[PDB]
């Protein structure tokens, strides 16, 4: 019943290469919207939340994307493998597909 924090790897998978939906005020360092995220950013959010400054994390997600027959960069994130903002004309459907596809062999346990 004690509310804890999602352990490192979780949020690392959650907020990495994200795009800020709205402005953020915590710990004196202001995070404007549209700014992408890195390990520095994410760990900073970690610490900030550890200070009880912030809990919710508004971000633009593929679900929230109104791009039709596709998606956008602001709704997506980095390119992961390239660590840089996702390039236009990207395979993201297939990306996703393979990304969760390879693990298919290793959950027997």
């Amino acid at each position: 019943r004690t509310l804890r924090l999602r352990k490192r790897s979780d949020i690392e998978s959650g907020l990495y290469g994200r795009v800020l939906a709205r402005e953020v005020e915590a710990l004196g360092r202001r995070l404007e919207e549209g700014r992408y995220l890195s390990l520095e950013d994410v760990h900073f959010l970690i610490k900030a939340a550890e200070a009880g400054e912030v809990r919710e994390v508004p971000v633009r997600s593929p679900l929230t994307c109104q791009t039709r027959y596709g998606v956008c960069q602001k709704c997506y994130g980095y390119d992961l493998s390239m660590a840089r903002p996702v390039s236009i004309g990207e395979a993201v459907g297939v990306v996703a597909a393979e990304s969760i596809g390879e693990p298919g062999t290793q959950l027997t346990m």
């Binding site: 390039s87 990207e90 395979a91 297939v94 393979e98």
Partner: protein, 243 residues
């Protein structure tokens, strides 16, 4: 045809450890012993703890003490050699080995002194005992002093060695290896053939296609599904082009 074992061929033991031949090393360079007899394989100790097979280890130890003796070893399944037995075999073979160098006008090698000293740090050989007894213990553990056939210097620590049984597996690179530039095509659809003796190219799976798209190589994919495979004038005009 006489087929000598080539580079890349499948080989494995009775204890279930596979592999392929990687770059056979010249007789010159090789981790030999004070008798100057180099080893024949030098297999990496990784697949052992992950795949959990100790039988090859014990087999190699019995082969260690046994090579010196040459006598055979019948170890029926679940009933056979045990740690004390093989231990005595080790002590035996070593007694006669240290004997081999003692009467032939030799003694403890300085490099061996070094290896024994470094091993004495982690308690690998019981301290307070002379290097002779220490090499008795070490050799008993399954490992002895090896010298890099390249540098000539020993190795930081002991290396388990011995006689062990292996096998030359059916799959042979001289067979499995195949390639084709431009061959025949299927009658129904102009798609190239497959198989080896049929002289045909590999197929690009659905998942292959997907991955190719994931990279975002549009042309590579297009050429793959068209020019490179069955395309009407595509393959022909291709051969034309590169020619």
């Amino acid at each position: 045809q006489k087929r000598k074992l080539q580079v890349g061929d499948k080989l494995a033991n009775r204890h279930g450890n596979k592999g392929v031949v990687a770059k056979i090393l010249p007789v010159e360079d090789m981790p030999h012993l004070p008798d100057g007899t180099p080893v024949d394989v030098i297999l990496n100790p990784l697949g052992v703890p992950s795949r959990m097979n100790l039988g090859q280890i014990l087999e190699t130890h019995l082969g260690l003490a046994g090579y010196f003796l040459g006598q055979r070893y019948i170890s029926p399944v679940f009933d056979g050699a045990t740690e004390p037995e093989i231990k005595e075999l080790l002590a035996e073979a070593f007694n006669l080995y240290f004997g081999k160098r003692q009467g032939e006008g030799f003694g403890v090698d300085k490099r061996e002194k070094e290896v024994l000293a470094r091993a004495e740090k982690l308690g690998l050989v019981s301290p307070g005992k002379s290097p002779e007894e220490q090499l008795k213990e070490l050799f008993d553990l399954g490992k002895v002093v090896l010298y890099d056939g390249r540098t000539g210097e020993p190795f930081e620590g002991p290396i388990v060695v011995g006689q062990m049984f292996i096998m030359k597996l059916y799959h042979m690179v001289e067979d499995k290896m195949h390639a084709r530039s431009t061959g025949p095509y299927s009658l129904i659809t102009q798609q190239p053939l497959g198989g080896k003796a049929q002289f045909g190219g590999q197929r690009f799976g659905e998942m292959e296609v997907w991955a190719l798209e994931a990279y975002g190589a549009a042309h590579t994919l297009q050429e793959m599904l068209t020019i490179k495979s069955d395309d009407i004038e595509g393959r022909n005009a291709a051969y034309q082009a590169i020619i």
